[PDB]
Design a protein around this nucleic acid. Structure first.
Length: 160
RNA sequence: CACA
């Protein structure tokens, strides 16, 4: 399940109370405790929809202790392989346009739309190879398209 | 992005 969050760029004194308040104010229920490490934390959301809401609501927007939080899907390093999620896709971007960006970095084995509350669209992309997805992620992350900037992140690749 |  993609309900597990990574909370990056935390300050040297962000504690679970601080994270609890951020998710409380953002009205993101969490399904377990915040595990705070050194400059980063983890938390589970009740389901995939709530985790994505936290990412879209908080990641790069919410400032804790004068630092913008990163809030992304927690992906084990060894599972950063073929699969990306792409957020902040323009609401009325035709699939063929998105596909013509995607295929510039490899073979797309699958591109699935993810139901989202926001007006932007979200897709999970699976590339043929680890290399293709890393090129997609480096090149598509930050790409500005129809008044929006793509956010591209790994999602777990458990089958490669 | 967890691992004495």
């Amino acid at each position: 399940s993609m309900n597990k969050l990574y909370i990056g760029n935390l300050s040297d004194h962000a504690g679970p109370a601080d994270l609890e308040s951020v998710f409380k104010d953002a009205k993101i229920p969490v399904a377990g405790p915040f595990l705070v490490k050194t400059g980063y934390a983890f938390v589970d959301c009740p389901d995939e929809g709530w985790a994505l809401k936290a990412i879209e609501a908080l990641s790069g927007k919410m400032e804790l202790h004068g630092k913008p939080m990163e809030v992304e899907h927690s992906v084990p390093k060894r599972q950063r392989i073929r699969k990306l999620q792409i957020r902040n896709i323009p609401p009325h971007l035709q699939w063929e346009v998105l596909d013509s960006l995607l295929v510039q970095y490899g073979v797309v084995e699958s591109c699935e739309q993810v139901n989202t509350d926001s007006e932007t669209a979200v897709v999970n992309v699976t590339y043929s190879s680890k290399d293709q997805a890393r090129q997609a992620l480096d090149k598509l992350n930050g790409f500005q398209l129809e008044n929006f900037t793509l956010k591209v992140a790994y999602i777990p690749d458990e089958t490669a």
